[PDB]
Protein backbone atom coordinates (compact mmCIF):
# COMPACT_ATOMS: atom_id res chain seq x y z
CA UNK A 1 0.00 0.00 0.00
CA UNK A 2 1.73 3.13 -1.32
CA UNK A 3 0.27 6.63 -1.55
CA UNK A 4 0.80 8.51 -4.82
CA UNK A 5 -0.29 12.11 -5.66
CA UNK A 6 0.53 11.76 -9.35
CA UNK A 7 0.81 15.13 -11.10
CA UNK A 8 -0.84 13.54 -14.13
CA UNK A 9 -3.21 14.44 -16.93
CA UNK A 10 -4.55 10.90 -16.33
CA UNK A 11 -6.06 9.51 -13.16
CA UNK A 12 -9.20 9.97 -11.11
CA UNK A 13 -9.51 13.52 -9.77
CA UNK A 14 -10.60 13.88 -6.17
CA UNK A 15 -10.57 10.21 -5.20
CA UNK A 16 -8.09 7.52 -4.12
CA UNK A 17 -8.15 4.37 -6.26
CA UNK A 18 -6.10 1.17 -6.22
CA UNK A 19 -4.22 -0.48 -9.09
CA UNK A 20 -3.29 -4.16 -9.37
CA UNK A 21 -0.13 -5.72 -10.85
CA UNK A 22 -1.34 -4.79 -14.37
CA UNK A 23 -1.58 6.85 -17.59
CA UNK A 24 1.03 5.99 -20.24
CA UNK A 25 2.93 9.13 -21.27
CA UNK A 26 6.02 10.59 -19.58
CA UNK A 27 4.57 14.09 -19.17
CA UNK A 28 2.07 12.53 -16.73
CA UNK A 29 3.21 11.19 -13.35
CA UNK A 30 0.93 8.15 -13.71
CA UNK A 31 3.74 6.50 -15.72
CA UNK A 32 6.75 8.79 -15.19
CA UNK A 33 6.60 8.16 -11.42
CA UNK A 34 3.90 5.50 -11.36
CA UNK A 35 6.48 3.21 -12.94
CA UNK A 36 8.91 3.94 -10.09
CA UNK A 37 6.29 2.71 -7.64
CA UNK A 38 5.26 -0.25 -9.80
CA UNK A 39 8.75 -1.61 -10.54
CA UNK A 40 9.65 -2.10 -6.86
CA UNK A 41 7.35 -5.14 -6.53
CA UNK A 42 4.82 -3.44 -4.24
CA UNK A 43 1.78 -5.62 -3.61
CA UNK A 44 -0.75 -2.84 -4.31
CA UNK A 45 -0.54 0.82 -5.35
CA UNK A 46 -3.15 3.43 -4.37
CA UNK A 47 -3.10 6.60 -6.47
CA UNK A 48 -4.44 10.15 -6.39
CA UNK A 49 -4.31 12.83 -9.09
CA UNK A 50 -3.02 16.38 -8.56
CA UNK A 51 -4.81 18.97 -10.71
CA UNK A 52 -5.30 22.72 -10.72
CA UNK A 53 -8.62 23.90 -9.31
CA UNK A 54 -9.88 24.89 -12.77
CA UNK A 55 -10.14 21.59 -14.63
CA UNK A 56 -13.11 19.52 -15.78
CA UNK A 57 -14.07 16.75 -18.22
CA UNK A 58 -14.20 16.94 -21.99
CA UNK A 59 -17.50 15.76 -23.44
CA UNK A 60 -19.15 15.09 -26.80
CA UNK A 61 -22.87 14.80 -27.63
CA UNK A 62 -24.30 12.91 -30.62
CA UNK A 63 -27.69 12.83 -32.35
CA UNK A 64 -29.72 10.40 -34.44
CA UNK A 65 -30.42 10.38 -38.18
CA UNK A 66 -33.03 7.64 -38.79
CA UNK A 67 -35.72 10.28 -38.30
CA UNK A 68 -35.52 13.33 -40.55
CA UNK A 69 -35.02 15.53 -37.46
CA UNK A 70 -31.88 14.75 -35.47
CA UNK A 71 -32.23 14.27 -31.71
CA UNK A 72 -29.63 13.54 -29.04
CA UNK A 73 -29.31 9.84 -28.17
CA UNK A 74 -25.61 9.28 -27.26
CA UNK A 75 -23.05 11.32 -25.31
CA UNK A 76 -19.33 10.69 -24.84
CA UNK A 77 -16.87 11.93 -22.22
CA UNK A 78 -13.38 10.97 -21.09
CA UNK A 79 -13.02 8.35 -18.37
CA UNK A 80 -11.26 10.97 -16.23
CA UNK A 81 -11.19 14.73 -16.88
CA UNK A 82 -8.64 16.27 -19.24
CA UNK A 83 -8.22 18.62 -22.19
CA UNK A 84 -6.40 16.02 -24.30
CA UNK A 85 -7.42 15.73 -27.95
CA UNK A 86 -9.30 12.45 -27.57
CA UNK A 87 -10.75 12.40 -31.08
CA UNK A 88 -13.54 10.05 -32.17
CA UNK A 89 -14.91 9.24 -35.63
CA UNK A 90 -18.29 7.68 -36.46
CA UNK A 91 -18.62 6.52 -40.09
CA UNK A 92 -21.29 4.52 -41.86
CA UNK A 93 -20.54 0.82 -42.18
CA UNK A 94 -19.76 -0.46 -45.67
CA UNK A 95 -22.14 -3.43 -45.61
CA UNK A 96 -25.18 -2.54 -43.48
CA UNK A 97 -26.65 0.96 -43.36
CA UNK A 98 -28.03 0.38 -39.85
CA UNK A 99 -24.50 -0.47 -38.66
CA UNK A 100 -21.92 2.24 -38.03
CA UNK A 101 -18.20 2.09 -37.25
CA UNK A 102 -17.23 3.78 -33.96
CA UNK A 103 -13.56 4.74 -34.30
CA UNK A 104 -11.72 6.30 -31.34
CA UNK A 105 -8.38 8.13 -31.15
CA UNK A 106 -5.99 9.13 -28.38
CA UNK A 107 -4.50 12.07 -30.30
CA UNK A 108 -4.39 10.73 -33.87
CA UNK A 109 -3.68 6.98 -33.50
CA UNK A 110 -6.73 4.72 -33.81
CA UNK A 111 -7.42 3.62 -30.24
CA UNK A 112 -10.47 1.50 -31.08
CA UNK A 113 -12.79 0.61 -33.96
CA UNK A 114 -15.92 -1.56 -33.96
CA UNK A 115 -19.43 -1.69 -35.42
CA UNK A 116 -22.84 -2.03 -33.76
CA UNK A 117 -26.26 -2.20 -35.42
CA UNK A 118 -27.60 1.10 -34.04
CA UNK A 119 -28.94 0.19 -30.59
CA UNK A 120 -28.06 2.97 -28.15
CA UNK A 121 -27.64 0.73 -25.10
CA UNK A 122 -25.50 -1.81 -26.96
CA UNK A 123 -23.39 0.94 -28.54
CA UNK A 124 -22.78 2.42 -25.09
CA UNK A 125 -22.01 -1.06 -23.75
CA UNK A 126 -19.44 -1.67 -26.49
CA UNK A 127 -17.83 1.73 -25.92
CA UNK A 128 -17.70 1.17 -22.14
CA UNK A 129 -16.94 -2.53 -21.58
CA UNK A 130 -14.28 -3.03 -24.26
CA UNK A 131 -10.73 -2.69 -23.00
CA UNK A 132 -9.47 -0.21 -25.61
CA UNK A 133 -11.87 2.41 -24.18
CA UNK A 134 -10.13 2.71 -20.81
CA UNK A 135 -9.73 6.39 -21.75
CA UNK A 136 -13.43 7.15 -22.37
CA UNK A 137 -16.95 6.58 -21.02
CA UNK A 138 -20.00 6.58 -23.30
CA UNK A 139 -23.35 7.66 -21.88
CA UNK A 140 -26.89 7.64 -23.26
CA UNK A 141 -28.95 10.78 -23.85
CA UNK A 142 -32.27 9.33 -25.05
CA UNK A 143 -34.01 5.96 -25.42
CA UNK A 144 -34.44 5.66 -29.18
CA UNK A 145 -33.09 2.89 -31.43
CA UNK A 146 -31.73 5.05 -34.27
CA UNK A 147 -28.46 5.65 -36.13
CA UNK A 148 -26.25 8.63 -35.32
CA UNK A 149 -25.07 11.33 -37.71
CA UNK A 150 -21.76 10.85 -39.49
CA UNK A 151 -18.80 12.72 -37.96
CA UNK A 152 -15.00 12.49 -37.96
CA UNK A 153 -12.28 13.17 -35.39
CA UNK A 154 -14.43 14.83 -32.71
CA UNK A 155 -12.30 16.29 -29.90
CA UNK A 156 -13.88 15.92 -26.46
CA UNK A 157 -13.72 19.52 -25.20
CA UNK A 158 -14.58 21.29 -21.96
CA UNK A 159 -11.66 20.45 -19.66
CA UNK A 160 -8.12 21.40 -18.67
CA UNK A 161 -4.78 19.69 -18.20
CA UNK A 162 -3.99 17.78 -15.04
CA UNK A 163 -0.56 19.45 -15.08
CA UNK A 164 -2.09 22.93 -15.45
CA UNK A 165 -0.32 24.27 -12.35
CA UNK A 166 1.51 22.71 -9.38
CA UNK A 167 0.34 24.99 -6.54
CA UNK A 168 0.47 24.62 -2.77
CA UNK A 169 -3.24 23.99 -2.12
CA UNK A 170 -3.31 21.82 -5.25
CA UNK A 171 -0.71 19.58 -3.62
CA UNK A 172 -2.30 19.74 -0.16
CA UNK A 173 -5.69 18.48 -1.38
CA UNK A 174 -4.10 15.08 -2.00
CA UNK A 175 -2.82 14.88 1.58
CA UNK A 176 -6.22 15.95 2.90
CA UNK A 177 -7.72 13.09 0.89
CA UNK A 178 -5.07 10.62 2.13
CA UNK A 179 -6.01 11.54 5.72
CA UNK A 180 -9.05 9.24 5.78
CA UNK A 181 -7.09 6.08 4.89
CA UNK A 182 -3.84 4.49 6.07
CA UNK A 183 -0.86 3.72 3.83
CA UNK A 184 2.57 2.17 4.23
CA UNK A 185 4.25 5.26 2.79
CA UNK A 186 3.79 8.59 1.02
CA UNK A 187 6.30 10.05 -1.44
CA UNK A 188 4.98 13.52 -2.46
CA UNK A 189 5.38 12.70 -6.21
CA UNK A 190 8.82 14.18 -6.68
CA UNK A 191 8.15 17.92 -6.28
CA UNK A 192 11.27 19.56 -4.86
CA UNK A 193 9.37 22.72 -3.85
CA UNK A 194 10.31 23.26 -0.21
CA UNK A 195 6.90 24.59 0.85
CA UNK A 196 5.21 21.36 -0.24
CA UNK A 197 7.79 19.32 1.67
CA UNK A 198 7.29 21.34 4.86
CA UNK A 199 3.50 21.15 4.56
CA UNK A 200 3.82 17.39 4.15
CA UNK A 201 6.06 17.28 7.24
CA UNK A 202 3.48 19.11 9.36
CA UNK A 203 0.67 16.96 7.94
CA UNK A 204 2.55 13.74 8.73
CA UNK A 205 3.26 15.02 12.25
CA UNK A 206 -0.49 15.54 12.68
CA UNK A 207 -1.18 12.03 11.39
CA UNK A 208 1.46 10.65 13.77
CA UNK A 209 -0.43 12.30 16.62
CA UNK A 210 -3.34 10.15 15.40
CA UNK A 211 -1.11 7.05 15.43
CA UNK A 212 -0.92 7.05 11.61
CA UNK A 213 2.85 6.73 11.21
CA UNK A 214 2.85 6.75 7.41
CA UNK A 215 6.36 6.74 5.94
CA UNK A 216 7.18 10.07 4.29
CA UNK A 217 9.92 9.99 1.65
CA UNK A 218 11.39 13.12 0.08
CA UNK A 219 14.43 14.56 -1.64
CA UNK A 220 16.07 17.79 -2.68
CA UNK A 221 16.21 19.41 -6.09
CA UNK A 222 18.79 18.65 -8.77
CA UNK A 223 20.28 22.11 -8.18
CA UNK A 224 20.96 21.23 -4.53
CA UNK A 225 24.64 20.59 -3.96
CA UNK A 226 25.73 18.00 -1.40
CA UNK A 227 25.73 21.00 0.94
CA UNK A 228 22.15 21.96 0.03
CA UNK A 229 21.05 18.31 -0.06
CA UNK A 230 22.37 17.88 3.48
CA UNK A 231 20.80 21.16 4.62
CA UNK A 232 17.36 20.14 3.36
CA UNK A 233 17.70 16.63 4.79
CA UNK A 234 18.72 18.06 8.17
CA UNK A 235 15.80 20.52 8.07
CA UNK A 236 13.56 17.49 8.53
CA UNK A 237 14.38 15.46 11.65
CA UNK A 238 11.40 13.10 11.85
CA UNK A 239 11.62 9.32 11.90
CA UNK A 240 8.97 8.94 9.18
CA UNK A 241 10.66 11.47 6.83
CA UNK A 242 13.51 10.59 4.46
CA UNK A 243 15.33 12.95 2.06
CA UNK A 244 16.96 11.23 -0.90
CA UNK A 245 20.17 12.99 -1.90
CA UNK A 246 21.28 12.21 -5.44
CA UNK A 247 19.63 12.27 -8.84
CA UNK A 248 19.16 9.00 -10.71
CA UNK A 249 18.76 7.75 -14.28
CA UNK A 250 16.67 4.72 -15.25
CA UNK A 251 15.64 5.04 -18.93
CA UNK A 252 15.74 8.63 -20.25
CA UNK A 253 14.81 11.15 -17.53
CA UNK A 254 17.05 12.76 -14.95
CA UNK A 255 15.11 12.03 -11.76
CA UNK A 256 15.35 14.53 -8.94
CA UNK A 257 16.08 13.04 -5.48
CA UNK A 258 12.43 13.42 -4.53
CA UNK A 259 11.45 11.59 -7.72
CA UNK A 260 13.70 8.57 -7.11
CA UNK A 261 12.33 8.55 -3.55
CA UNK A 262 9.24 6.99 -5.20
CA UNK A 263 11.18 3.87 -6.16
CA UNK A 264 12.97 3.90 -2.80
CA UNK A 265 9.49 3.79 -1.25
CA UNK A 266 8.56 0.92 -3.54
CA UNK A 267 11.59 -1.05 -2.36
CA UNK A 268 10.95 -0.22 1.30
CA UNK A 269 7.29 -1.29 1.18
CA UNK A 270 7.85 -4.39 -0.96
CA UNK A 271 10.78 -5.65 1.14
CA UNK A 272 8.72 -6.19 4.28
CA UNK A 273 10.09 -6.35 7.80
CA UNK A 274 12.80 -8.89 6.95
CA UNK A 275 14.38 -7.12 3.98
CA UNK A 276 16.36 -3.90 4.17
CA UNK A 277 17.63 -1.46 1.53
CA UNK A 278 20.83 -0.75 3.48
CA UNK A 279 22.95 -2.00 0.55
CA UNK A 280 20.31 -2.94 -2.04
CA UNK A 281 21.06 -2.51 -5.73
CA UNK A 282 18.61 -0.33 -7.67
CA UNK A 283 17.26 -0.47 -11.22
CA UNK A 284 18.51 3.05 -12.02
CA UNK A 285 21.28 3.05 -14.62
CA UNK A 286 23.23 6.07 -13.32
CA UNK A 287 23.30 8.49 -10.39
CA UNK A 288 24.95 11.88 -9.88
CA UNK A 289 26.76 13.69 -8.28
CA UNK A 290 29.11 10.88 -7.23
CA UNK A 291 29.85 10.70 -3.50
CA UNK A 292 33.15 9.65 -1.93
CA UNK A 293 33.37 8.06 1.52
CA UNK A 294 33.49 11.53 3.09
CA UNK A 295 30.53 12.77 1.04
CA UNK A 296 28.57 9.61 1.86
CA UNK A 297 29.31 9.97 5.57
CA UNK A 298 28.39 13.67 5.60
CA UNK A 299 25.14 12.98 3.74
CA UNK A 300 24.12 10.07 5.96
CA UNK A 301 24.96 12.15 9.04
CA UNK A 302 22.57 14.81 7.68
CA UNK A 303 19.71 12.32 7.35
CA UNK A 304 20.15 12.02 3.58
CA UNK A 305 19.37 8.71 1.89
CA UNK A 306 22.40 8.35 -0.39
CA UNK A 307 22.54 6.59 -3.75
CA UNK A 308 25.85 6.14 -5.56
CA UNK A 309 27.43 4.03 -8.29
CA UNK A 310 29.66 2.12 -5.89
CA UNK A 311 29.57 -1.08 -8.01
CA UNK A 312 28.39 -2.27 -11.43
CA UNK A 313 24.91 -0.94 -10.59
CA UNK A 314 23.41 1.86 -8.53
CA UNK A 315 23.36 0.83 -4.85
CA UNK A 316 21.58 2.51 -1.97
CA UNK A 317 24.29 3.25 0.57
CA UNK A 318 22.16 2.97 3.74
CA UNK A 319 18.66 2.73 5.20
CA UNK A 320 18.91 6.10 6.97
CA UNK A 321 16.04 8.52 7.58
CA UNK A 322 15.84 12.19 8.52
CA UNK A 323 16.22 11.24 12.19
CA UNK A 324 19.82 10.10 11.53
CA UNK A 325 20.72 13.58 12.78
CA UNK A 326 19.80 11.85 16.02
CA UNK A 327 20.15 12.46 19.78
CA UNK A 328 21.90 10.57 22.55
CA UNK A 329 18.97 8.71 24.11
CA UNK A 330 17.80 7.05 20.87
CA UNK A 331 20.33 4.78 19.18
CA UNK A 332 21.32 4.73 15.52
CA UNK A 333 19.07 1.74 14.77
CA UNK A 334 16.17 4.10 15.47
CA UNK A 335 17.39 6.10 12.45
CA UNK A 336 16.88 3.24 9.97
CA UNK A 337 13.80 2.96 7.76
CA UNK A 338 13.25 -0.78 8.20
CA UNK A 339 13.44 -0.50 11.99
CA UNK A 340 11.03 2.45 12.01
CA UNK A 341 8.59 0.58 9.77
CA UNK A 342 8.88 -2.39 12.13
CA UNK A 343 8.17 -0.11 15.11
CA UNK A 344 5.13 1.43 13.38
CA UNK A 345 3.79 -2.04 12.58
CA UNK A 346 4.25 -2.95 16.24
CA UNK A 347 2.32 0.18 17.23
CA UNK A 348 -0.43 -0.81 14.79
CA UNK A 349 -0.73 -4.35 16.16
CA UNK A 350 -0.80 -2.87 19.66
CA UNK A 351 -3.54 -0.50 18.50
CA UNK A 352 -5.45 -3.65 17.56
CA UNK A 353 -4.68 -5.12 20.99
CA UNK A 354 -5.84 -2.05 22.92
CA UNK A 355 -9.11 -2.04 21.01
CA UNK A 356 -9.34 -5.77 21.81
CA UNK A 357 -9.30 -4.70 25.49
CA UNK A 358 -11.69 -1.77 25.23
CA UNK A 359 -12.49 -1.33 28.94
CA UNK A 360 -14.51 -4.49 29.51
CA UNK A 361 -11.50 -5.53 31.60
CA UNK A 362 -10.96 -3.90 34.97
CA UNK A 363 -7.92 -1.69 35.57
CA UNK A 364 -6.66 -3.84 38.46
CA UNK A 365 -3.66 -6.13 38.80
CA UNK A 366 -5.59 -8.91 37.04
CA UNK A 367 -6.37 -6.83 33.97
CA UNK A 368 -2.78 -5.60 33.89
CA UNK A 369 -1.53 -9.18 33.95
CA UNK A 370 -3.98 -10.15 31.20
CA UNK A 371 -2.98 -7.31 28.88
CA UNK A 372 0.76 -7.58 29.47
CA UNK A 373 0.56 -11.35 28.98
CA UNK A 374 -1.23 -10.85 25.65
CA UNK A 375 1.55 -8.50 24.55
CA UNK A 376 4.15 -10.96 25.83
CA UNK A 377 2.47 -13.68 23.77
CA UNK A 378 2.54 -11.54 20.62
CA UNK A 379 6.19 -10.55 21.04
CA UNK A 380 7.09 -14.16 21.89
CA UNK A 381 5.48 -15.26 18.63
CA UNK A 382 7.60 -12.65 16.85
CA UNK A 383 10.66 -14.02 18.65
CA UNK A 384 9.77 -17.53 17.48
CA UNK A 385 9.54 -16.09 13.97
CA UNK A 386 13.15 -14.92 14.45
CA UNK A 387 12.35 -11.24 13.89
CA UNK A 388 13.16 -10.43 17.54
CA UNK A 389 16.31 -11.58 19.29
CA UNK A 390 15.20 -10.29 22.70
CA UNK A 391 12.36 -8.20 24.12
CA UNK A 392 11.10 -6.94 27.47
CA UNK A 393 7.52 -5.68 27.79
CA UNK A 394 6.45 -4.27 31.16
CA UNK A 395 4.16 -1.76 32.83
CA UNK A 396 4.83 1.92 32.12
CA UNK A 397 5.27 2.83 35.77
CA UNK A 398 6.22 6.40 34.81
CA UNK A 399 2.81 7.06 33.27
CA UNK A 400 1.03 4.42 35.37
CA UNK A 401 2.19 6.25 38.50
CA UNK A 402 0.11 9.27 37.40
CA UNK A 403 -2.34 7.43 35.12
CA UNK A 404 -5.95 7.97 36.11
CA UNK A 405 -8.46 5.18 36.69
CA UNK A 406 -9.64 4.87 33.09
CA UNK A 407 -6.19 4.87 31.41
CA UNK A 408 -3.42 2.27 31.48
CA UNK A 409 0.12 2.53 30.10
CA UNK A 410 2.70 -0.09 29.13
CA UNK A 411 5.91 -0.19 27.10
CA UNK A 412 8.02 -2.51 24.99
CA UNK A 413 11.69 -2.68 24.04
CA UNK A 414 12.95 -5.21 21.48
CA UNK A 415 16.14 -5.90 19.52
CA UNK A 416 16.35 -6.94 15.86
CA UNK A 417 18.83 -8.63 13.53
CA UNK A 418 21.66 -6.61 11.97
CA UNK A 419 22.81 -6.75 8.35
CA UNK A 420 26.21 -5.35 7.36
Amino acid sequence: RLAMPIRANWGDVGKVVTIKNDGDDMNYSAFKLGKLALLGNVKELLLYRLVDGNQKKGTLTLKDTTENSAKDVIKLETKYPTARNFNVTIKSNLVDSDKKDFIFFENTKQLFSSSIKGTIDEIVLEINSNLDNEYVIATKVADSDTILANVVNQALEGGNDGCTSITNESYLKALEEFERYSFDSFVLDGVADEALQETTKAWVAKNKELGKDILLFLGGKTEDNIKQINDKSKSFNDENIVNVGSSAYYENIKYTPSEVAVYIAALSVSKGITGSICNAKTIFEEVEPRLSQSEVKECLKSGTLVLDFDDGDVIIVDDVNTFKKYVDDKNEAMGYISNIMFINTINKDTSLKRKEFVGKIFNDATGQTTVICALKKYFEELMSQGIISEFNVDIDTELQATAKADEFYWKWDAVKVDVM
Binding site: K330, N331, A333, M334, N339, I343, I346, N347, T350, K353, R354, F357, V358, G359, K360, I361, F362, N363, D364, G367, V371, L375, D396, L399, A405, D406, E407, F408, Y409, W410, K411, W412, D413, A414, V415, K416
Partner: protein, 90 residues
Protein backbone atom coordinates in the same frame (compact mmCIF):
# COMPACT_ATOMS: atom_id res chain seq x y z
CA UNK B 1 -21.91 -18.86 51.62
CA UNK B 2 -24.60 -17.80 54.10
CA UNK B 3 -26.30 -20.64 55.99
CA UNK B 4 -29.26 -20.01 58.30
CA UNK B 5 -31.06 -22.52 60.53
CA UNK B 6 -34.62 -21.18 60.54
CA UNK B 7 -37.17 -22.78 62.86
CA UNK B 8 -40.90 -22.38 62.25
CA UNK B 9 -43.82 -22.52 64.67
CA UNK B 10 -47.41 -23.37 63.84
CA UNK B 11 -49.94 -22.32 66.47
CA UNK B 12 -53.59 -23.34 66.33
CA UNK B 13 -56.38 -24.28 68.70
CA UNK B 14 -56.95 -27.56 66.80
CA UNK B 15 -53.90 -29.82 66.98
CA UNK B 16 -54.81 -31.77 63.85
CA UNK B 17 -54.80 -28.43 62.07
CA UNK B 18 -51.22 -27.97 63.27
CA UNK B 19 -50.34 -31.38 61.84
CA UNK B 20 -51.98 -30.61 58.49
CA UNK B 21 -50.35 -27.19 58.20
CA UNK B 22 -46.91 -28.54 59.04
CA UNK B 23 -47.33 -31.41 56.59
CA UNK B 24 -48.26 -29.14 53.70
CA UNK B 25 -45.52 -26.67 54.59
CA UNK B 26 -42.89 -29.43 54.59
CA UNK B 27 -44.18 -30.83 51.31
CA UNK B 28 -44.14 -27.40 49.69
CA UNK B 29 -40.61 -26.73 50.91
CA UNK B 30 -39.34 -30.05 49.57
CA UNK B 31 -41.12 -29.97 46.21
CA UNK B 32 -40.40 -26.27 45.65
CA UNK B 33 -36.84 -26.81 46.81
CA UNK B 34 -36.01 -23.07 46.83
CA UNK B 35 -37.75 -19.83 47.77
CA UNK B 36 -37.62 -16.44 46.07
CA UNK B 37 -35.74 -14.13 48.41
CA UNK B 38 -37.19 -11.04 46.70
CA UNK B 39 -39.67 -10.42 43.91
CA UNK B 40 -36.82 -9.28 41.64
CA UNK B 41 -36.00 -13.04 41.36
CA UNK B 42 -32.26 -12.26 41.58
CA UNK B 43 -31.58 -14.36 44.69
CA UNK B 44 -32.97 -17.66 45.93
CA UNK B 45 -32.77 -19.54 49.21
CA UNK B 46 -32.07 -23.21 48.48
CA UNK B 47 -33.24 -25.74 51.04
CA UNK B 48 -30.74 -28.05 52.74
CA UNK B 49 -32.89 -30.04 55.17
CA UNK B 50 -36.37 -29.65 56.69
CA UNK B 51 -37.08 -31.53 59.91
CA UNK B 52 -40.11 -31.57 62.22
CA UNK B 53 -40.01 -32.45 65.92
CA UNK B 54 -43.69 -32.67 66.79
CA UNK B 55 -43.02 -33.04 70.52
CA UNK B 56 -41.32 -29.65 70.70
CA UNK B 57 -43.16 -26.81 72.39
CA UNK B 58 -45.66 -24.94 70.25
CA UNK B 59 -44.54 -21.49 71.46
CA UNK B 60 -41.06 -21.48 73.00
CA UNK B 61 -39.30 -23.79 70.53
CA UNK B 62 -41.38 -24.44 67.41
CA UNK B 63 -41.88 -27.68 65.54
CA UNK B 64 -40.37 -27.35 62.08
CA UNK B 65 -36.63 -26.81 61.65
CA UNK B 66 -35.35 -25.84 58.21
CA UNK B 67 -31.79 -25.08 57.11
CA UNK B 68 -31.40 -22.73 54.15
CA UNK B 69 -28.23 -21.66 52.36
CA UNK B 70 -27.45 -19.05 49.73
CA UNK B 71 -24.33 -18.17 47.75
CA UNK B 72 -23.34 -14.59 47.00
CA UNK B 73 -20.66 -13.11 44.76
CA UNK B 74 -18.37 -10.39 46.09
CA UNK B 75 -19.33 -7.30 44.10
CA UNK B 76 -16.31 -5.38 42.80
CA UNK B 77 -17.05 -2.61 40.30
CA UNK B 78 -13.50 -1.37 39.93
CA UNK B 79 -12.11 0.97 37.32
CA UNK B 80 -11.94 0.00 33.66
CA UNK B 81 -9.15 0.09 31.07
CA UNK B 82 -10.88 2.53 28.75
CA UNK B 83 -7.50 3.74 27.43
CA UNK B 84 -4.57 1.39 26.78
CA UNK B 85 -1.55 3.12 25.21
CA UNK B 86 2.08 2.15 24.75
CA UNK B 87 5.30 3.26 23.10
CA UNK B 88 8.38 1.69 21.58
CA UNK B 89 12.17 1.75 21.68
CA UNK B 90 15.08 -0.51 20.71
Amino acid sequence: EITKTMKCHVVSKNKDEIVKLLETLETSLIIDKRVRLREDKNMYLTLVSVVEDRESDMFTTGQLTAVFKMIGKIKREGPTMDKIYGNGNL
